[PDB]
Amino acid sequence: MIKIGAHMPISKGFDRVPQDTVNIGGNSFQIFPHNARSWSAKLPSDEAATKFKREMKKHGIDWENAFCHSGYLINLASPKDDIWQKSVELLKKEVEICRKLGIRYLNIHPGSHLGTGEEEGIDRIVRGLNEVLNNTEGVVILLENVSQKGGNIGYKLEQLKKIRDLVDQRDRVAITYDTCHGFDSGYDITKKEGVEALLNEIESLFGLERLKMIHLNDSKYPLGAAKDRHERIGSGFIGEEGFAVFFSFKEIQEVPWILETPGGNEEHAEDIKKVFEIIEKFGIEV
Ligand SMILES: [Zn+2]
Ligand SMILES: [Zn+2]
Ligand SMILES: [Zn+2]
């Protein structure tokens, strides 16, 4: 069964999210844990967490299909110690928001060394994840591949493995694959040989059960462009044919597809329709 959804707004409450998710034709979703402007975030009230949980039950959303995503402030690779410390403290709080909501997965970008060096930046990330994981329980942190922009770490799957193998609680570190960031970095899912190489690399670096989520994004730019600009499904350089190849892999189907393409609920309902249209047109099983 296809597990698909989108990044959902939380601005009207967490509890609106399950209903909004089924209204766009999804059964999966991603949300931010908060809308804080700075380094401090509130927890949801007991009242709000309870409503969220009730709506999850009401709509039969699978808890393996519900993800949180960290905000853009957190940078565990920062060469500024105070930003590193505030990032750690905020990440811990985001794990506590997840715990409160019942959310099992917290997705993050590993970070940027800002031109101080990839190897030292990886160590900083590792140490930061240790401080976080060693002071929390339950929640699994997802490392997401990113584009090769400035001092971003994680544009090659190899880098995500370097972080993971140094972490204390490796079972609480897993992986998210973003189709747009990968395409930006040369991972060519428009060809079955590219998808096969991607899967072989994932299986060998992490094992396939570490792949917890795919971010389903088309790209504004060509393969290898390193641009980090998402596009609506079928409207970019991955395209309808490219996605049809990607969708044809059973291994890919086992994993929730989360849209982070431009627009709101309305555009995402259309992108979800496009995905089923692509699957129908190209005769993909299932
Ligand atoms: Zn992301
Ligand atoms: Zn993403
Ligand atoms: Zn992106």
Side-chain angles (χ1 to χ4, degrees):
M1 79 153 327
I2 296 307
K3 297 167 286 302
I4 185 158
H7 192 284
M8 311 299 295
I10 59 165
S11 60
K12 307 206 174 155
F14 293 113
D15 67 298
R16 296 200 124 278
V17 162
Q19 178 67 86
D20 285 342
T21 289
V22 350
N23 284 350
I24 65 169
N27 56 21
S28 295
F29 65 76
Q30 165 176 277
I31 50 173
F32 288 126
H34 57 79
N35 280 336
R37 289 271 206 105
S38 191
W39 293 106
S40 282
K42 297 169 62 189
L43 288 176
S45 61
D46 297 338
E47 183 56 26
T50 292
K51 273 189 276 185
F52 172 72
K53 290 172 171 197
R54 184 180 56 58
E55 289 294 314
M56 289 282 287
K57 188 180 179 77
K58 175 187 182 193
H59 293 289
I61 307 289
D62 191 333
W63 285 93
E64 291 301 309
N65 298 3
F67 306 88
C68 276
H69 191 305
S70 295
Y72 67 93
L73 296 190
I74 291 163
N75 181 11
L76 299 181
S78 184
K80 308 320 169 203
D81 182 64
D82 54 1
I83 290 177
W84 184 91
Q85 297 194 50
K86 295 184 201 300
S87 290
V88 171
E89 286 319 307
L90 192 56
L91 200 46
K92 288 178 178 172
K93 161 62 61 66
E94 297 190 341
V95 171
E96 296 305 313
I97 292 164
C98 292
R99 280 301 300 121
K100 229 286 218 297
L101 299 175
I103 296 282
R104 312 186 169 152
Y105 302 108
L106 181 54
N107 181 88
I108 71 178
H109 296 199
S112 173
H113 57 73
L114 306 168
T116 54
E118 164 181 330
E119 309 98 311
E120 24 286 293
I122 280 173
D123 281 351
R124 274 179 238 127
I125 290 165
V126 161
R127 284 186 268 108
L129 291 177
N130 286 340
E131 285 315 305
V132 173
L133 296 170
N134 290 337
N135 289 283
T136 58
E137 300 298 342
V139 182
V140 163
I141 291 182
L142 306 183
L143 293 184
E144 183 184 335
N145 65 120
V146 294
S147 306
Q148 187 180 17
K149 303 241 307 206
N152 281 1
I153 289 147
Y155 54 92
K156 291 308 179 174
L157 297 173
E158 170 73 30
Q159 290 169 348
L160 303 191
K161 112 113 191 317
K162 286 167 183 191
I163 301 168
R164 238 204 116 237
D165 296 348
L166 286 178
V167 163
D168 288 344
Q169 295 182 232
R170 302 184 302 270
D171 294 338
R172 295 180 58 210
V173 183
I175 304 281
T176 287
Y177 182 76
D178 180 309
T179 59
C180 176
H181 304 155
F183 199 67
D184 259 351
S185 312
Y187 291 101
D188 187 5
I189 57 155
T190 72
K191 298 292 169 291
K192 70 155 155 63
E193 297 85 19
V195 178
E196 279 161 0
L198 174 60
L199 297 168
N200 293 336
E201 201 163 318
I202 287 165
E203 160 79 349
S204 151
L205 263 39
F206 318 102
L208 281 178
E209 82 74 54
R210 279 347 247 173
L211 178 53
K212 293 303 184 178
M213 166 164 59
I214 290 151
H215 289 159
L216 201 60
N217 302 129
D218 212 331
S219 192
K220 290 292 196 192
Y221 298 88
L223 177 72
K227 290 287 184 186
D228 193 23
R229 295 290 137 117
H230 299 181
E231 174 64 286
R232 306 277 301 278
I233 305 298
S235 287
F237 284 98
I238 297 179
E240 292 192 7
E241 320 196 60
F243 282 121
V245 166
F246 187 60
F247 295 161
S248 71
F249 281 83
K250 176 92 214 70
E251 305 86 340
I252 293 305
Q253 300 187 12
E254 290 305 19
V255 182
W257 307 340
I258 301 294
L259 301 160
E260 300 181 304
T261 57
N265 284 336
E266 198 179 328
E267 291 61 67
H268 290 138
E270 294 171 348
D271 284 3
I272 293 179
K273 286 177 54 176
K274 177 65 73 184
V275 169
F276 285 115
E277 163 182 344
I278 283 171
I279 286 170
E280 184 144 3
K281 185 204 302 85
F282 287 87
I284 313 291
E285 337 205 30
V286 291

